[PDB]
Amino acid sequence: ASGMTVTDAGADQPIVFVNRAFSTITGYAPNEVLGRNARFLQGPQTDAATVARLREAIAAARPIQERILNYRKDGQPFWNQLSISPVRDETGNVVAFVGVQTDVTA
Amino acid sequence: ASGMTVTDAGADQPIVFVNRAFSTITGYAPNEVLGRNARFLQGPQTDAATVARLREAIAAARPIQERILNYRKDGQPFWNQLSISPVRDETGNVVAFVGVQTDVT
Ligand SMILES: Cc1cc2nc3c(=O)[nH]c(=O)nc-3n(C[C@H](O)[C@H](O)[C@H](O)COP(=O)(O)O)c2cc1C
Ligand SMILES: Cc1cc2nc3c(=O)[nH]c(=O)nc-3n(C[C@H](O)[C@H](O)[C@H](O)COP(=O)(O)O)c2cc1C
C-alpha cells in the first residue's frame, strides 16, 4: 500500500494530512508530522541533486517523480518512490500539493 | 479561496480530509463530513445527469469537471465548480480522489 501526504501550497508546504500507509512506511504517527515540511524524512545519504530537483519543481508547482533515500522515525533507511503533483482550481491557483510515497527498498 | 476534499479510492469514497475553504463554502465543519460520501451536498434541484457523469467518472477513475448545484449546511443553494482527479501510485493503483470545489454563485 502506498503512502499519501497532503501539504498546504504556500509557506514551506506544511503537512496537513497523511493516510495510514504513510505511518506504516515512515513509522511516524500523524501527530508527529502535521504542520512540518516532509524534509525531516531525509538524512545524510539522501542525494542532494534529487533534493534540488524536488525544491525547484515545488517552487514552480511542477509535477515531479523521484526515487529518494528517506529514513523511518527510528532511523532505518528506505527507498521512497515519490510522486508530487500540485492540486489546482480551474483558474490555475495551487490549492495544495499531494505526494504519493511507495517503499521500493526490497 | 477554493475548497479541497480528499476521499479514499474504494468503499464509496468516504471523505478523509477537507481544507478551511471547504467549511467557509459549505458551512460544514470537518467533524460533520469526515467518513461520509460528499453526495450529501446535493439536494432537490441537483441535475441527475450531472450526478450520473460524476458516478461514472469516479467508477473508472477518470478526471471530470462539472458545475453542480449543491446546498450549504443551512440549506442555501450554491453553484459548485467541481473538479475531481484520481491520485495514483507509479504502478497506476488509485490511492485516493481529490476534489476542488469553487463557489461560482
Ligand atoms: C506533498 C509533498 C510530499 C513530500 N514528500 C516527501 C517525502 O516523502 N520524502 C522527501 O524526502 N521529501 C518529500 N517532499 C519534499 C520536501 O518537503 C522538500 O520539498 C524537499 O526536500 C526540497 O525542498 P528543501 O530543499 O526546501 O528541503 C514532499 C513535498 C511535498 C510538497
Ligand atoms: C473527492 C471527491 C469530491 C467530491 N465532491 C463533491 C462535491 O463537492 N459535490 C457533489 O455534489 N459531489 C461531490 N462528489 C461526488 C459524490 O461523492 C458522488 O460521487 C456523486 O454523487 C456520484 O455518485 P452517486 O451516484 O453514487 O452519488 C465528490 C466525489 C469525490 C470522489
PDB file of N, CA and C and ligand atoms in Angstrom, chain B residues 5-8 12-13 22 37-39 41-42 46 51-52 54-56 58 68-70 80 82 84-85 97-101, ligand 2:
ATOM      1  N   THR B   5     -11.335  18.570  -1.086  1.00  0.00           N
ATOM      2  CA  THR B   5     -11.881  17.352  -0.450  1.00  0.00           C
ATOM      3  C   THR B   5     -11.025  16.175  -0.914  1.00  0.00           C
ATOM      4  N   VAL B   6     -10.499  15.397   0.031  1.00  0.00           N
ATOM      5  CA  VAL B   6      -9.769  14.129  -0.248  1.00  0.00           C
ATOM      6  C   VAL B   6     -10.639  12.978   0.272  1.00  0.00           C
ATOM      7  N   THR B   7     -10.818  11.941  -0.544  1.00  0.00           N
ATOM      8  CA  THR B   7     -11.583  10.718  -0.194  1.00  0.00           C
ATOM      9  C   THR B   7     -10.692   9.495  -0.408  1.00  0.00           C
ATOM     10  N   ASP B   8     -11.006   8.403   0.291  1.00  0.00           N
ATOM     11  CA  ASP B   8     -10.498   7.046  -0.024  1.00  0.00           C
ATOM     12  C   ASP B   8     -10.897   6.721  -1.465  1.00  0.00           C
ATOM     13  N   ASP B  12     -17.021   3.458  -1.469  1.00  0.00           N
ATOM     14  CA  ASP B  12     -17.999   4.581  -1.548  1.00  0.00           C
ATOM     15  C   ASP B  12     -17.330   5.912  -1.171  1.00  0.00           C
ATOM     16  N   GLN B  13     -16.005   5.977  -1.316  1.00  0.00           N
ATOM     17  CA  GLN B  13     -15.183   7.221  -1.308  1.00  0.00           C
ATOM     18  C   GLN B  13     -15.547   8.112  -0.121  1.00  0.00           C
ATOM     19  N   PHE B  22     -13.285  24.709   2.307  1.00  0.00           N
ATOM     20  CA  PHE B  22     -14.418  23.753   2.185  1.00  0.00           C
ATOM     21  C   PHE B  22     -15.503  24.122   3.205  1.00  0.00           C
ATOM     22  N   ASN B  37     -19.650  10.033   2.226  1.00  0.00           N
ATOM     23  CA  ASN B  37     -19.615  10.353   0.776  1.00  0.00           C
ATOM     24  C   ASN B  37     -20.123  11.790   0.602  1.00  0.00           C
ATOM     25  N   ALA B  38     -19.482  12.570  -0.275  1.00  0.00           N
ATOM     26  CA  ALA B  38     -19.744  14.013  -0.485  1.00  0.00           C
ATOM     27  C   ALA B  38     -21.134  14.246  -1.096  1.00  0.00           C
ATOM     28  N   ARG B  39     -21.856  13.188  -1.478  1.00  0.00           N
ATOM     29  CA  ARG B  39     -23.172  13.313  -2.165  1.00  0.00           C
ATOM     30  C   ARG B  39     -24.191  14.037  -1.265  1.00  0.00           C
ATOM     31  N   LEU B  41     -24.038  16.840  -0.170  1.00  0.00           N
ATOM     32  CA  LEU B  41     -24.020  18.262  -0.615  1.00  0.00           C
ATOM     33  C   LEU B  41     -25.110  18.505  -1.664  1.00  0.00           C
ATOM     34  N   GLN B  42     -25.657  17.435  -2.242  1.00  0.00           N
ATOM     35  CA  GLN B  42     -26.675  17.501  -3.322  1.00  0.00           C
ATOM     36  C   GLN B  42     -28.064  17.630  -2.686  1.00  0.00           C
ATOM     37  N   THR B  46     -30.609  19.525  -7.764  1.00  0.00           N
ATOM     38  CA  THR B  46     -29.348  18.989  -8.346  1.00  0.00           C
ATOM     39  C   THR B  46     -29.684  18.216  -9.628  1.00  0.00           C
ATOM     40  N   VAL B  51     -24.857  14.230 -11.833  1.00  0.00           N
ATOM     41  CA  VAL B  51     -24.503  13.252 -10.765  1.00  0.00           C
ATOM     42  C   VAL B  51     -24.063  11.943 -11.433  1.00  0.00           C
ATOM     43  N   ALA B  52     -24.808  11.479 -12.443  1.00  0.00           N
ATOM     44  CA  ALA B  52     -24.511  10.240 -13.201  1.00  0.00           C
ATOM     45  C   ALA B  52     -23.119  10.343 -13.842  1.00  0.00           C
ATOM     46  N   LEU B  54     -20.532  12.195 -12.827  1.00  0.00           N
ATOM     47  CA  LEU B  54     -19.581  12.085 -11.687  1.00  0.00           C
ATOM     48  C   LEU B  54     -19.452  10.610 -11.290  1.00  0.00           C
ATOM     49  N   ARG B  55     -20.586   9.923 -11.133  1.00  0.00           N
ATOM     50  CA  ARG B  55     -20.640   8.496 -10.726  1.00  0.00           C
ATOM     51  C   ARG B  55     -19.783   7.649 -11.676  1.00  0.00           C
ATOM     52  N   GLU B  56     -19.936   7.825 -12.989  1.00  0.00           N
ATOM     53  CA  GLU B  56     -19.219   7.002 -14.000  1.00  0.00           C
ATOM     54  C   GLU B  56     -17.729   7.374 -13.992  1.00  0.00           C
ATOM     55  N   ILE B  58     -15.835   8.540 -11.487  1.00  0.00           N
ATOM     56  CA  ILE B  58     -15.213   8.001 -10.244  1.00  0.00           C
ATOM     57  C   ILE B  58     -15.044   6.487 -10.403  1.00  0.00           C
ATOM     58  N   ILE B  68     -22.162  21.921 -10.581  1.00  0.00           N
ATOM     59  CA  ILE B  68     -23.249  21.138  -9.927  1.00  0.00           C
ATOM     60  C   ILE B  68     -23.878  21.997  -8.830  1.00  0.00           C
ATOM     61  N   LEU B  69     -25.212  22.003  -8.763  1.00  0.00           N
ATOM     62  CA  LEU B  69     -25.963  22.675  -7.677  1.00  0.00           C
ATOM     63  C   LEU B  69     -25.773  21.865  -6.395  1.00  0.00           C
ATOM     64  N   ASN B  70     -25.199  22.491  -5.373  1.00  0.00           N
ATOM     65  CA  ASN B  70     -25.024  21.888  -4.026  1.00  0.00           C
ATOM     66  C   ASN B  70     -25.771  22.765  -3.017  1.00  0.00           C
ATOM     67  N   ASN B  80     -21.479  24.909  -7.531  1.00  0.00           N
ATOM     68  CA  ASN B  80     -20.165  24.308  -7.191  1.00  0.00           C
ATOM     69  C   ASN B  80     -19.431  23.963  -8.487  1.00  0.00           C
ATOM     70  N   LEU B  82     -16.900  22.028  -9.632  1.00  0.00           N
ATOM     71  CA  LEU B  82     -16.282  20.831  -9.009  1.00  0.00           C
ATOM     72  C   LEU B  82     -15.341  20.160 -10.014  1.00  0.00           C
ATOM     73  N   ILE B  84     -12.712  16.786 -10.047  1.00  0.00           N
ATOM     74  CA  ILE B  84     -12.281  15.548  -9.338  1.00  0.00           C
ATOM     75  C   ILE B  84     -11.192  14.870 -10.167  1.00  0.00           C
ATOM     76  N   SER B  85     -10.130  14.433  -9.496  1.00  0.00           N
ATOM     77  CA  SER B  85      -8.993  13.719 -10.129  1.00  0.00           C
ATOM     78  C   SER B  85      -8.563  12.561  -9.238  1.00  0.00           C
ATOM     79  N   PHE B  97      -9.001  10.006  -4.163  1.00  0.00           N
ATOM     80  CA  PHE B  97      -9.561  11.039  -5.069  1.00  0.00           C
ATOM     81  C   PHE B  97      -9.393  12.403  -4.405  1.00  0.00           C
ATOM     82  N   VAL B  98      -9.079  13.413  -5.209  1.00  0.00           N
ATOM     83  CA  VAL B  98      -9.045  14.835  -4.767  1.00  0.00           C
ATOM     84  C   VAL B  98     -10.102  15.605  -5.563  1.00  0.00           C
ATOM     85  N   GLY B  99     -10.971  16.321  -4.852  1.00  0.00           N
ATOM     86  CA  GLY B  99     -11.975  17.226  -5.428  1.00  0.00           C
ATOM     87  C   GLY B  99     -11.629  18.660  -5.085  1.00  0.00           C
ATOM     88  N   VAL B 100     -11.735  19.563  -6.056  1.00  0.00           N
ATOM     89  CA  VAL B 100     -11.611  21.028  -5.814  1.00  0.00           C
ATOM     90  C   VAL B 100     -12.983  21.657  -6.064  1.00  0.00           C
ATOM     91  N   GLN B 101     -13.451  22.435  -5.091  1.00  0.00           N
ATOM     92  CA  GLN B 101     -14.821  22.996  -5.028  1.00  0.00           C
ATOM     93  C   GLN B 101     -14.705  24.517  -4.991  1.00  0.00           C
TER      94      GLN B 101
HETATM   95  C1  LIG C   2     -13.010  13.619  -3.922  1.00  0.00           C
HETATM   96  C2  LIG C   2     -14.468  13.797  -4.253  1.00  0.00           C
HETATM   97  C3  LIG C   2     -15.074  15.024  -4.026  1.00  0.00           C
HETATM   98  C4  LIG C   2     -16.420  15.203  -4.323  1.00  0.00           C
HETATM   99  N1  LIG C   2     -17.008  16.401  -4.093  1.00  0.00           N
HETATM  100  C5  LIG C   2     -18.316  16.585  -4.405  1.00  0.00           C
HETATM  101  C6  LIG C   2     -18.998  17.869  -4.179  1.00  0.00           C
HETATM  102  O1  LIG C   2     -18.336  18.824  -3.709  1.00  0.00           O
HETATM  103  N2  LIG C   2     -20.308  17.975  -4.506  1.00  0.00           N
HETATM  104  C7  LIG C   2     -21.005  16.937  -5.027  1.00  0.00           C
HETATM  105  O2  LIG C   2     -22.220  17.065  -5.320  1.00  0.00           O
HETATM  106  N3  LIG C   2     -20.441  15.730  -5.246  1.00  0.00           N
HETATM  107  C8  LIG C   2     -19.145  15.503  -4.970  1.00  0.00           C
HETATM  108  N4  LIG C   2     -18.572  14.253  -5.198  1.00  0.00           N
HETATM  109  C9  LIG C   2     -19.379  13.200  -5.818  1.00  0.00           C
HETATM  110  C10 LIG C   2     -20.146  12.279  -4.894  1.00  0.00           C
HETATM  111  O3  LIG C   2     -19.301  11.833  -3.829  1.00  0.00           O
HETATM  112  C11 LIG C   2     -20.624  11.117  -5.772  1.00  0.00           C
HETATM  113  O4  LIG C   2     -19.514  10.567  -6.485  1.00  0.00           O
HETATM  114  C12 LIG C   2     -21.637  11.548  -6.833  1.00  0.00           C
HETATM  115  O5  LIG C   2     -22.856  11.998  -6.230  1.00  0.00           O
HETATM  116  C13 LIG C   2     -21.945  10.431  -7.843  1.00  0.00           C
HETATM  117  O6  LIG C   2     -22.113   9.149  -7.231  1.00  0.00           O
HETATM  118  P1  LIG C   2     -23.516   8.599  -6.630  1.00  0.00           P
HETATM  119  O7  LIG C   2     -24.459   8.451  -7.807  1.00  0.00           O
HETATM  120  O8  LIG C   2     -23.147   7.268  -6.008  1.00  0.00           O
HETATM  121  O9  LIG C   2     -23.914   9.663  -5.638  1.00  0.00           O
HETATM  122  C14 LIG C   2     -17.209  14.075  -4.896  1.00  0.00           C
HETATM  123  C15 LIG C   2     -16.597  12.849  -5.119  1.00  0.00           C
HETATM  124  C16 LIG C   2     -15.254  12.667  -4.818  1.00  0.00           C
HETATM  125  C17 LIG C   2     -14.617  11.326  -5.078  1.00  0.00           C
END
